[PDB]
Design a protein around this ligand. Structure first.
Ligand SMILES: OCCN1C[C@H](O)[C@@H](O)[C@H](O)[C@H]1CO
Length: 666
C-alpha cells in the first residue's frame, strides 16, 4: 500500500486529520535535503537552477513559487499586494519539479515559513518553531503524477450542487427585501443569467448567527420562496463569532455547555467582531462542532440551500485585554506634554490590537480533555468550522448537496467546502492573481473556487468588471461581490448592458461542459485547472507559462488582464482552435498552429482554445441552470473527435451510474 508516499514524524504532532489515508511512520533518514532540530524545526534543500516549485494553494504571487517567502498563518488581510507573506489559507503542499522531482506535505497546524529562494536564490528552506509535525514525501516521475498521488490520500474533493455553476451576485450592503428585489429585477428584466444572490451580514438580527432580522424579513421562508420561484437561491453568510447577548439561544447554549474557546482561567474568551463582543465556538472539539453545525438547520428548514463562512481565521477586531491596553495608552498620549508619546506610536497601538498574535495566545481549545493554546493549532480553525457545517449537512439531509465555501482553510477542508479568494481589490493585477491561484488550489484539493469578480475593495470600472467576468466564466465559483461604500458593481449599473449579457451568456453556454469536467475531475481525484507544464511536460516554453491554464483535457484559457488591451500574447504548445463567444451570440473559430501568437479579444468577447483532436459541447444561452437545454448541444472543435459528457440531476449524490455518462461525437 501507498508505495510512493512515506511519512516522517517529528516529535508529538497534533492530528489535523488532513489525510483520509493512513500512512505508517517511516523509520529511515529523511530522503531529501537536510533536517535540523537545532532551533525548532528546519528543512533545507538546494534547488537546481532550472527547478520549478509548485504548490501552496492559496498563497501570493505566481504558479512557480520561487523567488519569495510564504508563511502559512491564516490572516485577515484585505490588501493583497506582492509583499504579503500570509493570506487566509494554509496549504502546506509543495512540489519541487526538475532534474530531481518530489512532493512534500508539511502536516503542521501552526506558523510555517516557506523561504523559497528569498534569502538565497538556490535555497529552499521550510521552518517552524516546534518540531512536532508529520512530513509526507511523495515520489513520482513528474509533478502531475505527484499531485494525483496527493489528491488520492487527502480524500475526495467537495462537490457542489449544479446550481452553483451559475452566476452569483453579492454585496456588503444588501439589507432589505427591496434591496434583494432590485437585484433580482435588474438581472431578470435585462435577461442577464443568474442563479444566486448572496446575503451578507445585514440579514441577521444585530449580526447574530442563526437569526434573521424579523423586521426586514417577517416571513423569511416566504421571501426565500419568492426568490427561488424565479430560480434565485439566497446564499447567507455565517461568521465565526457568536454575539454575547442574554437570552440569545446560541450564546446561552455555548456558555452552559462549555462549547466556547476559553481563557487560561476557564472563562469564555471575548473577541470583538461585527456584533461587538463575541465568543468563538471551540471548532476543534467534536461535541462543540456538532452543536455549531446543527444550527444550520435553522436556515435549511427555511428553504436555504447554500452558505458561506467568513471571518474564520478567526478574525479579531480587538479583545477585551487589547482594548484596555489601547485605552490606557491613549490616556497617556492624551496627557503627554513633552512629546514623549508620538502620534504614530498611538497609531501603531491601534493597529496592534487587530488580529493580534498575543490574542491568539490568550484562548484555548478543548481536545481529548487536553487544553491546547490556539496559536499552536491556529490554521485549523476555519477548516474545522467548515467541517462542522459539512458534517451537519450529511446528518440533516444526506441525499442532498449544499453550496458551501469558506474564507480560511487548511488541507482537509477541501472535503467539506470550497473557498473564495477573500478580499481582493478592483485592480487589474488581481485578475492575474485570481488566475494564478487556480491550479495551485486544485493541487491541494480545492476545486470549487473563485475570486470576487470586479474586485471586492475599492472602485471598479465597466471594463475591469467585464474582463473579470470573462475569467469568471471558467471558475467554478462565479460571483460578483463588492465591499461597503464601493461604486455599485452589479452588471445592470453600467451602460450598454448587452455586453454583460453576452459575457455571462458564455458562462451559461459552457455550464454543461464545465460541470462535466468538474465532476469527472472530482470523482477521479484529478485537477480541473492545470498549469501548462502538467500537460506539456517536454516543452520548455510551456512549463514556464503562467498566464494561461489548461482546463479538463479539452481546452486552454488565456484571459485578457491588461487595461485598454484589445488582445494578448499566447503560446500554443500544440495546434488549437481559437474560439470566441461573440456579442451577437455566434461562436467564431480559427485554427492556430503551435507557437507564439497575438490574439485579438474585444472587451465583450470571451476567448478559449480547443486542443487538437478534441471537442466540447456548447448549449444555447439560458438565464438559469435549470433552463439549460443539454439535449443536442452543438459540438465545437475537431472533426472525428469525441467527448464524454458527465451529467446527473445536479442535486443528489448518485454519482456512479452508467446513465451519468454519454459519448458525444462531432
Ligand atoms: O470584516 C468584514 C467581513 N467581511 C469579509 C468578507 O471577506 C467579505 O466578503 C464580506 O463582505 C465582509 C462583510 O461581511
Amino acid at each position: 500500500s501507498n508505495a510512493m508516499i512515506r511519512k516522517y514524524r517529528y516529535g508529538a504532532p497534533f492530528d489535523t486529520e488532513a489525510l483520509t489515508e493512513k500512512i505508517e511512520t517511516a523509520e529511515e533518514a529523511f530522503p531529501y535535503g537536510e533536517i535540523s532540530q537545532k532551533e525548532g524545526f528546519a528543512f533545507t534543500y538546494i534547488m537546481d537552477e532550472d527547478d520549478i516549485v509548485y504548490g501552496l494553494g492559496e498563497s501570493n504571487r505566481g504558479i512557480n513559487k520561487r523567488g519569495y517567502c510564504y508563511i502559512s498563518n491564516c490572516t485577515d488581510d484585505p490588501i493583497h499586494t506582492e509583499d504579503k507573506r500570509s493570506l487566509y489559507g494554509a496549504h502546506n503542499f509543495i512540489i519541487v519539479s526538475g532534474k530531481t522531482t518530489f512532493g512534500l506535505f508539511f502536516d503542521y497546524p501552526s506558523k510555517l515559513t516557506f523561504d523559497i529562494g528569498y534569502t538565497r536564490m538556490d535555497t529552499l528552506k521550510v521552518s517552524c518553531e516546534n518540531a512536532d509535525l508529520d512530513i509526507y514525501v511523495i515520489e513520482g516521475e513528474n509533478a502531475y503524477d505527484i499531485v494525483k498521488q496527493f489528491r488520492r490520500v487527502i480524500g475526495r474533493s467537495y462537490i457542489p450542487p449544479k446550481f452553483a455553476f451559475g452566476f452569483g451576485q453579492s454585496r456588503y450592503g444588501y439589507t432589505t427585501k427591496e434591496d434583494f428585489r432590485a437585484v433580482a429585477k435588474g438581472y431578470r428584466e435585462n435577461h442577464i443569467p443568474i442563479d444566486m444572490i448572496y446575503m451578507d451580514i445585514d440579514y441577521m438580527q444585530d449580526f447574530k448567527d442563526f437569526t434573521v432580522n424579523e423586521k426586514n424579513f417577517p416571513d423569511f421562508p416566504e421571501f426565500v420562496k419568492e426568490m427561488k420561484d424565479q430560480e434565485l437561491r439566497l446564499i447567507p453568510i455565517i461568521d465565526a463569532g457568536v454575539k454575547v447577548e442574554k437570552g440569545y439561544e446560541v450564546y446561552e447554549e455555548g456558555v452552559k455547555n462549555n462549547y466556547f474557546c476559553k481563557r487560561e482561567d476557564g472563562s469564555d474568551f471575548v473577541a470583538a467582531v461585527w456584533p461587538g463582543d463575541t465568543h468563538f465556538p471551540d471548532m476543534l472539539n467534536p461535541e462543540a462542532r456538532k452543536w455549531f453545525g446543527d444550527k444550520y438547520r435553522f436556515l435549511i428548514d427555511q428553504g436555504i440551500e447554500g452558505f458561506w463562512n467568513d471571518m474564520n481565521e478567526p478574525a479579531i477586531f480587538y479583545s477585551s485585554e487589547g482594548l484596555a491596553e489601547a485605552k490606557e495608552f491613549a490616556g497617556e498620549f492624551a496627557k503627554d506634554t513633552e512629546g514623549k508619546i508620538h502620534p504614530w506610536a498611538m497609531q501603531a497601538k491601534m493597529k496592534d490590537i487587530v488580529n493580534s498574535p498575543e490574542d491568539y495566545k490568550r484562548f484555548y481549545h478543548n481536545v481529548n480533555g487536553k487544553k491546547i493554546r490556539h496559536d499552536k493549532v491556529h490554521n485549523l480553525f476555519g477548516y474545522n468550522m467548515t467541517r462542522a457545517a459539512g458534517e451537519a449537512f450529511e446528518r440533516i439531509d444526506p441525499e442532498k448537496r449544499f453550496l458551501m465555501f469558506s474564507r480560511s482553510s487548511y488541507i482537509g477542508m477541501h472535503r467539506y467546502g470550497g473557498i473564495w479568494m477573500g478580499d481582493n481589490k478592483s485592480w487589474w493585477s488581481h485578475i492575474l492573481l485570481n488566475l494564478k491561484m487556480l491550479p495551485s488550489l486544485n493541487m491541494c484539493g480545492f476545486m470549487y473556487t473563485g475570486a470576487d469578480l470586479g474586485g471586492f475593495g475599492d472602485d471598479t470600472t465597466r471594463d475591469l468588471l467585464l474582463r473579470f467576468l470573462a475569467l469568471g466564466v471558467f471558475t467554478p465559483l462565479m460571483r460578483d461581490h463588492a465591499a461597503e461604500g464601493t461604486r455599485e458593481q452589479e452588471c445592470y449599473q453600467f451602460e450598454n448592458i448587452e455586453d454583460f449579457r453576452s459575457v455571462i451568456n458564455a458562462r451559461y453556454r459552457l455550464v454543461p461542459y464545465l460541470y462535466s469536467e468538474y465532476m469527472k475531475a472530482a470523482l477521479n481525484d484529478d485537477m480541473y485547472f492545470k498549469p501548462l507544464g502538467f500537460v506539456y511536460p517536454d516543452d520548455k516554453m510551456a512549463i514556464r507559462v503562467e498566464d494561461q491554464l489548461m482546463l479538463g483535457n479539452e481546452i486552454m484559457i488565456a484571459p485578457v488582464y491588461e487595461q485598454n488591451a484589445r488582445g494578448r500574447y499566447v503560446y500554443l504548445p500544440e495546434e488549437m482552435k481559437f474560439i470566441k463567444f461573440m456579442p451577437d451570440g455566434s461562436i467564431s473559430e480559427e485554427v492556430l498552429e503551435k507557437g507564439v501568437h497575438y490574439v485579438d479579444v474585444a472587451l465583450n468577447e470571451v476567448p478559449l482554445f480547443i486542443r487538437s483532436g478534441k471537442c466540447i459541447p456548447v448549449a444555447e444561452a439560458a438565464e438559469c441552470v435549470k433552463d439549460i437545454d443539454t439535449e443536442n448541444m452543438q459540438l465545437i472543435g475537431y472533426e472525428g473527435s469525441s467527448y464524454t459528457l458527465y451529467e446527473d440531476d445536479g442535486i443528489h449524490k448518485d454519482y456512479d451510474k452508467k446513465e451519468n455518462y454519454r459519448v458525444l461525437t462531432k
